[PDB]
């Protein structure tokens, strides 16, 4: 019986139309998150995503779902930071997902007590310098 978090709102740095952050917490494996289409800019990494809480809450894990069809924007190299008001963010953990097409569970070391957690995606799969996206990204409580 662990509770899953319920995710109220979000941002993204960069997104494509129609596929912007809420689309990573509507529980729909098949609906992406995606960054803009174009990522030809210089600065187009990183990529911020945050995720809100209603309150702060109790987590003990996340487990972020990328894409299983397509390997633009499965998430490599990133900072998952976590915020208790919303507004300032503590680091976390680096954390490589590899560009893996397979989800990626991050098991913390204590229960966090964040309103907010936040992803500074430093690279990620794909044409090009490659994307951002996710299909789903969660959090739990034990
Ligand atoms: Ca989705």
Known sequence: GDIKIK???GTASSFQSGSNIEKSFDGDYSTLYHS???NGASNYFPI???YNFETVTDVDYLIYHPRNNGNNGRFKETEIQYSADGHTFTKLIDKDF???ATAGKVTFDQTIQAKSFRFIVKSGSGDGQGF???AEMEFFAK
Request: charged share 0%.
């Open 7 to 9: 995710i109220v709102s």
């Open 36 to 38: 803009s289409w174009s």
């Open 48 to 50: 911020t995503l945050t």
């Open 98 to 100: 590899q560009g893996s």
């Open 132 to 134: 951002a996206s996710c």
